[PDB]
Amino acid sequence: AEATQACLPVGSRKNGMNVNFYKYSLQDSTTYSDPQYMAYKYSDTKKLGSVSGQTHLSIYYGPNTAFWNTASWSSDLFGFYTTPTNVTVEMTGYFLPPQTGSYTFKFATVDDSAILSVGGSIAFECCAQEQPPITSTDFTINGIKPWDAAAPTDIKGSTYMYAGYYYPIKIVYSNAKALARLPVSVVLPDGTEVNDDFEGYVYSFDDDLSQSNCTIPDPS
Ligand SMILES: *[C@@H]1O[C@H](CO)[C@@H](O)[C@H](O)[C@H]1NC(C)=O
Ligand SMILES: *[C@@H]1O[C@H](CO)[C@@H](O)[C@H](O)[C@H]1NC(C)=O
Ligand SMILES: [Ca+2]
Numbered sequence: 001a002e003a004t005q006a007c008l009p010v011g012s013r014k015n016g017m018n019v020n021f022y023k024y025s026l027q028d029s030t031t032y033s034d035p036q037y038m039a040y041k042y043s044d045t046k047k048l049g050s051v052s053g054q055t056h057l058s059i060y061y062g063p064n065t066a067f068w069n070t071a072s073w074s075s076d077l078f079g080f081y082t083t084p085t086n087v088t089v090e091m092t093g094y095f096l097p098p099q100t101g102s103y104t105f106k107f108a109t110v111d112d113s114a115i116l117s118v119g120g121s122i123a124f125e126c127c128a129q130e131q132p133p134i135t136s137t138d139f140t141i142n143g144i145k146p147w148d149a150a151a152p153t154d155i156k157g158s159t160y161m162y163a164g165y166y167y168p169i170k171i172v173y174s175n176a177k178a179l180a181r182l183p184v185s186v187v188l189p190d191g192t193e194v195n196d197d198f199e200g201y202v203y204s205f206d207d208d209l210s211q212s213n214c215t216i217p218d219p220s
Contacts, residue, residue, distance in 0.1 A: 003160070003217075003218045003219060003220050004118065004119040004120075004122075004159055004160060004161070004167065004219075005119050005120030005121055005122070005126070005215065005216065005217050005218075005219075006119070006120060006126075006161070006162065006165035006166060006167045006168075006216045006219045007094065007120055007126035007127060007165070007166045007167075007168065007214050007215060007216060008165060008166060008213070008214060008216055009094070009126070009127050009166060009205040009208065009211065009214055010208075010211055010214075011127075011205040011206050011208050011211075012205075012206075013203050013204075013205060014052070014053065014203060014204040014205065014206075015053055015055065015199065015203060015204075016052065016053035016054045016055040016093065016199070016202055016203070016204060017052075017053075017054045017055070017057065017091045017092060017093035017169075017198075017202050017204060018050060018051075018052050018054070018091070018092050018093065018129065018130060018204055019050060019051050019052075019054050019078045019080070019089060019090065019091045019092075020047060020049070020050040020089070020090045020092075021047070021048040021049055021050065021077075021080055021082055021087060021088070021089055021090075022042050022043075022045050022046065022047055022048060022087065022088040022089070022090070023045050023046040023048060023087075023088075024045075024086050024087050024088045024174055024175070024176065025086060025176070026069075026070075026071050026083075026085065026086040026176065026177065027069070027086075027176055027177055028086075028176050029112065029145065029176050029177070031174075032088070032112060032113035032144070032145055032174040032176065033113065033144055033145045033146075033147060035137045035144060036135075036137070038113065038114075038115045038139075038144055038172050038174070039115070039117075039133065039134075039135060039136060039137045039139075039172075040132075040133035040134065040135050042088050042090065042133075042172060042174075043090070043132055043133050045088070048080075048082060048087075049080060050080075051078050051079055051080050052204065053204070054078050054091065055197060055198055055199035055202060056078075056196050056197050056198070057091060057171065057184040057196065057198050057202070058182060058183045058184045058185075058195070058196040059077060059084075059089070059173055059180050059181060059182040059183075059184075060076070060180070060181060060183070061074060061076045061077065061084035061085075061179065061180040061181075062178075062179050062180075063084075063085055063178060063179075065178075068177060068178045069177075070085075071083040071085050071086055072084070072085045077089060077180070084175060084180040085175060085176075085177060085178060085180070086175060086176055086177065087174070087175060087180075088172070088173070088174040088175075089171075089172070089173050089174075090133070090170065090171075090172050091169075091170065091171040091172075091173075092123070092124065092129050092130070092168075092169070092170050092204075093129065093168075093169055093202045093203060093204050094129070094166035094167060094168055094169065094202070094203050094204070094205065095118070095161075095166070095167045095168075095169045095198075095201055095202055096164075096165075096166055096167075096200075096201055096202075096203060097161040097162065097163055097164075097165070097167070097189075097201075098163060098200075098201075099163055099188065099189045099190065100161065100162050100163045100189065101160070101161070101188070101189025101190075102158055102159075102160055102161075102189055103158065103159050103160075103161050103186055103187070103188060103189065104156050104157070104158045104186065104187045105118070105140060105141060105156070105157050105158075105159070105184070105185070105186045106141070106154060106155065106156045106157075106184070106185050106186065106187070107141055107143050107152075107154075107155050107182055107183065107184060108153070108154060108183035108185065109151050109152065109153055109154075109181055109182075109183060110143035110145070110151055110152050110155065110181070110182060111151050111175065111179055111180065111181035111182070112145050112151075112174060112175045112176050112177070113143065113144055113145035113173070113174045113175075114141075114143040114144075114171065114172065114173040114174070114182050115139050115141065115142065115143065115144065115170075115171065115172045115173075116139060116140045116141035116143075116157055116169070116170070116171050116184075117136065117138065117139055117140055117168075117169070117170045117171075117172075118140040118157070118159045118167055118168070118169050119140075119159065119167060119168060120167075120168055120215055120216075120217070121134065121136065122134075122136050122138050122140075122168070123136075123167075123168035123169050123170040124168050124170060125168075125215075126168065126214040126215040126216075127205065127207065127208050127209055127211050127214035127215075128207050128209060129168070129204060129205060129206075129207060130206075130207050131207060133170070139157070140157035140158075140159055141155055141156065141157035142155075142157075143155055143182075145174075151181075161219075162219035162220055165216055165219045166203070166205075169202070171184070183195070183196070184196065184198075186198075186201075
């Protein structure tokens with residue numbers, strides 16, 4: 001009734017996360033403040049492309065700063081050539097806890113808008129990583145851009161996880177202008193912190209809905 005849903009896919013395990021990119025308008029500071037947009041409606045906009053096997057989850061970009069009202073192009077976002085000054089990105093994969101306990105994921109800051117969803121039927125459905133996004137607004141970290149207020153600082157979300165089970169994770173991040181900043185980390189059950197590089201923890205599987213026992217609703 002209370003344990004977070006996990007999965008156990010049996011397909012060949014791939015390292016890292018899948019990252020899709022989407023059209024986002026320069027200086028649109030309203031669309032990404034809709035919870036429905038950050039949850040799933042981003043997928044109804046123009047998909048630009050995707051990269052796989054991404055293990056470094058943090059977003060760090062700054063333009064030449066001569067104009068804070070023009071787009072700027074770069075591959076700094078996961079090796080994909082786009083406009084970090086204005087873009088929406090969807091990262092998906094499965095987080096694998098090597099120990100049982102509490103996992104506190106964190107955004108040191110959010111610039112402009114971002115989300116973290118953790119669990120089956122929250123981030124996405126088990127064995128269905130690359131299917132269209134589910135409608136859940138049940139964010140583990142809600143960093144949806146707070147309208148007229150300044151960027152938020154050290155916002156956290158905690159998930160209790162059981163060892164050896166794959167937990168679906170989805171981050172949806174958007175930027176409308178200038179800097180792109182989402183420094184992602186997690187404090188593990190033993191207390192140690194993992195910044196940026198999530199290699200060893202995050203994995204992908206090809207979709208396989210024929211596998212009926214993929215969903216584990218109560219890992220305890
Ligand atoms: C960002 O803005 C520029 C300027 O309008 C536009 O040409 C470009 O397509 C935009 N990029 C994305 C990914 O939406
Ligand atoms: C779930 O079923 C798959 C075969 O479809 C199998 O590989 C896996 O070991 C099963 N898990 C359990 C706990 O029975
Ligand atoms: Ca910005």
